[PDB]
């Protein structure tokens, strides 16, 4: 029963065993029933913690590899070893987003849909972070659509003070900056997000102020140093 599976995921979150929480949330989303917003966030941050651990470790052991006869072969093997783990978890959650969580949202569910599409774009960006040449272009395309579509959708059905829309705009801006290597478009979208957001600071709800104000502030920050 999912009623206790979500509780197991919450217990794993409390236990900082993010693999177990991501597994429980994978089970509850494989049960084909639609996901609550808090269960949405549970699965999202569980899987993002799981992949970000390997992201950080990959960063450190590839930075030292680029910094530097027989040990360099082993550090390259280790980088490939955890790269085949990062890509594995990425594709796992990507097919979780394709077979479920997207086909299970009608037109009246714009919010959840752009949530999952930003998830898809983020994980494809993480895949492109470790891809080279022919393996890169493809995912850089698969991210782009998965981003842009999402953008368009909530440019049509929710005001730019929503934390989900602002988070999608922020991840899109840093995708344009880091991967697409286009600081112009990144700065542009950061500006169109933050300005449109502050234009209606009235709509900041009592239960959504912290998240938005944070994301708007970090969008502004990224805009400063660029």
């Amino acid at each position: 029963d999912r009623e206790q599976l979500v509780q197991k995921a919450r217990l794993a979150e409390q236990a900082e065993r993010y693999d177990d929480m991501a597994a429980a949330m994978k089970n509850v989303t494989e049960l084909n029933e639609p996901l609550s917003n808090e269960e949405r966030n549970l699965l999202s941050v569980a899987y993002k913690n799981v992949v970000g651990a390997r992201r950080s470790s990959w960063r450190v052991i590839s930075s030292i590899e680029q910094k530097t006869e027989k040990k360099i072969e082993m550090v390259r093997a280790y980088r490939e070893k955890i790269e085949k783990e990062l890509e594995a978890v990425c594709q796992d959650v990507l097919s979780l987003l394709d077979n479920y969580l997207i086909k299970n949202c009608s037109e009246t569910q714009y919010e959840s849909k752009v949530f999952y599409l930003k998830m898809k774009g983020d994980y494809y960006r993480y895949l492109a972070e470790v891809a080279t040449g022919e393996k890169r272009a493809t995912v850089v395309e698969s991210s782009e659509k998965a981003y842009s579509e999402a953008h368009e959708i909530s440019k049509e059905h929710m005001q730019p003070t929503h934390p989900i829309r602002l988070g999608l705009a922020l991840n899109y801006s840093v995708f344009y900056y880091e991967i697409q290597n286009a600081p112009e478009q990144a700065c542009h979208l950061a500006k169109t997000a933050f300005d449109d957001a502050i234009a209606e600071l009235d709509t900041l709800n009592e239960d959504s102020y912290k998240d938005s104000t944070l994301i708007m502030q970090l969008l502004r920050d990224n805009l400063t140093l660029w």
Partner: peptide, 8 residues
């Protein structure tokens, strides 16, 4: 810190 949204 990190450019992207640090989602815990």
């Amino acid at each position: 810190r990190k450019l992207s949204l640090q989602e815990r």
